[PDB]
Target: Heterogeneous nuclear ribonucleoproteins A2/B1
Amino acid sequence: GSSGSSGMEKTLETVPLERKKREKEQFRKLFIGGLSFETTEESLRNYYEQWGKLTDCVVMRDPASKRSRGFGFVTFSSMAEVDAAMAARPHSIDGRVVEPKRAVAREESGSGPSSG
Model:
């Protein structure tokens, strides 16, 4: 008789709209979360290179540590491959359990209301 779990995901309300720009990007741009900080652009691509070749792979690095944040973006060549990557969970890289994201519409802190 085993069991246990937990979580906490916000909901938020009222999202600000912006020109956005570059749709093809966000369209074929997935945000990888939990790279272990030991997974570089390549090391990562080496993984997301099977489903498809990433035309652009960026890995965010700690803005304070200046090393690795543990998350980045993977831009596939086609919408099919990426789609395959989406339905290819879970994801294990660097010997750790990661978690990919659509990337589209991502938390973007701001300030000052702009409208009318």
The radius of gyration is 16 Å.
